[PDB]
Amino acid sequence: KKPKIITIASIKGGVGKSTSAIILATLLSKNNKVLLIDMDTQASITSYFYEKIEKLGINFTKFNIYEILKENVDIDSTIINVDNNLDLIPSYLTLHNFSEDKIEHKDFLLKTSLGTLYYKYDYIVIDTNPSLDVTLKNALLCSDYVIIPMTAEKWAVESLDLFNFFVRKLNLFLPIFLIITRFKKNRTHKTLFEILKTKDRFLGTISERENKDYIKEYENILEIFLKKI
Amino acid sequence: KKPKIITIASIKGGVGKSTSAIILATLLSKNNKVLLIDMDTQASITSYFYEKIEKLGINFTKFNIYEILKENVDIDSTIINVDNNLDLIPSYLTLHNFSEDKIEHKDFLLKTSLGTLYYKYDYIVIDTNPSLDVTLKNALLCSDYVIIPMTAEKWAVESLDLFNFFVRKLNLFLPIFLIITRFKKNRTHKTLFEILKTKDRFLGTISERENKDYIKEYENILEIFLKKI
Numbered sequence: 001k002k003p004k005i006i007t008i009a010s011i012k013g014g015v016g017k018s019t020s021a022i023i024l025a026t027l028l029s030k031n032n033k034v035l036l037i038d039m040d041t042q043a044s045i046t047s048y049f050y051e052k053i054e055k056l057g058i059n060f061t062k063f064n065i066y067e068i069l070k071e072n073v074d075i076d077s078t079i080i081n082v083d084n085n086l087d088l089i090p091s092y093l094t095l096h097n098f099s100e101d102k103i104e105h106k107d108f109l110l111k112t113s114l115g116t117l118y119y120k121y122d123y124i125v126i127d128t129n130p131s132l133d134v135t136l137k138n139a140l141l142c143s144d145y146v147i148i149p150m151t152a153e154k155w156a157v158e159s160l161d162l163f164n165f166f167v168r169k170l171n172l173f174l175p176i177f178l179i180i181t182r183f184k185k186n187r188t189h190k191t192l193f194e195i196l197k198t199k200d201r202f203l204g205t206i207s208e209r210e211n212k213d214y215i216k217e218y219e220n221i222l223e224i225f226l227k228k229i
Numbered sequence: 230k231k232p233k234i235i236t237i238a239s240i241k242g243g244v245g246k247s248t249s250a251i252i253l254a255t256l257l258s259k260n261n262k263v264l265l266i267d268m269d270t271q272a273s274i275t276s277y278f279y280e281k282i283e284k285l286g287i288n289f290t291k292f293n294i295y296e297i298l299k300e301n302v303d304i305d306s307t308i309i310n311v312d313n314n315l316d317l318i319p320s321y322l323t324l325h326n327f328s329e330d331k332i333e334h335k336d337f338l339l340k341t342s343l344g345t346l347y348y349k350y351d352y353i354v355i356d357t358n359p360s361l362d363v364t365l366k367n368a369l370l371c372s373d374y375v376i377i378p379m380t381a382e383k384w385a386v387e388s389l390d391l392f393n394f395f396v397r398k399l400n401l402f403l404p405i406f407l408i409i410t411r412f413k414k415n416r417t418h419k420t421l422f423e424i425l426k427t428k429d430r431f432l433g434t435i436s437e438r439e440n441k442d443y444i445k446e447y448e449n450i451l452e453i454f455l456k457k458i
Contacts, residue, residue, distance in 0.1 A: 011325055013243075013271055014242070041359075041360065093384050093391060096240055096361045096388075096391060099361065099363075100362070130270075130271075131328065132325045133362070134328075134329075153276075162323070162325060162326075166325075166326075
């Protein structure tokens, strides 16, 4: 076995990227050992788990993805058991410095650090900034798969082409899966859904929601995801 | 005189950066000619005026901020009159590739382009992405003033210092003004407020709210800003 590495990406903010990362990781953790890596400067994943992190007394100020990236700390030192079968490498606001940092072989830092990791996971789920930036490159050059939660807004198709172009540029051959989030049974979603539904990499829909109905929709998605890999 | 150029910036998303840009520019527009420059990859400002942009039939796939930065079009031809005394240079998804394009003197592209603008404005309000990136650098190096909206979240103060360290380093002359947005009466907002209210360039607070009272809060902010420059 080896870890199956999934990047959660979206070029649009507020479309449920980080929310999906958490819920998907959590569903996978029911029967798998899972690592979540919070490479989003927003740090929404780390903040979701903050109560658990504080209670464990973790010094994420010193042990976080940015410091892994700058090789000031080993990855082995940053890993937090935040839930059943679920580990986390947390994000911290110094990550904001990463786009401007001048580093040799900058794109392959996460790949290189993941190459040293002792601990073995079934799945690694990496959350990213909604930007086609150097962080996203570090994730993609690591990955086996990508999932893009996206909404039925103007420029949905075009954004897909934009993202694919970027991936092609990295000379990668990655399956990129699609999820329509904030879904409503209305006109504009029907237009996007009809275009998307015929893609082999389309996974399904998650309804807008202000054991629940949302979890089941995510379980569905996962089910289909696992049938296509 | 000459245009006064304000960048609205924040290194945290979902803090009302774009909304602030829109309302401050709209208020300024009552008695001034104002240009809004949508340099956020999110394109929220453009999306807010999209109904008017579409009624006008504009091709902002070709006439947009990214195409300016790449010197494929003249800035004059990108300008859209979106409201009373209010112009817009729109954003389009291709702005996402700007972080990775390799370009000489890349930091000064916006400043150079602004030097080819025929039209004269009283104020230019520039909206940016929540990142310490090259897009932010273009805005800042054009600008006379910076306004940062922020909210009472964990690491608000540390993030502000980081942004300061970034902004100071590429222009230590740039005044940085502060707003607290999404404001609520509770311990953790009170604490940020106690900290920020004593900073020379603190402007005030906007309440969380889903003619209005919040407009008049923006009016108060604009009033105290205009008195301080």
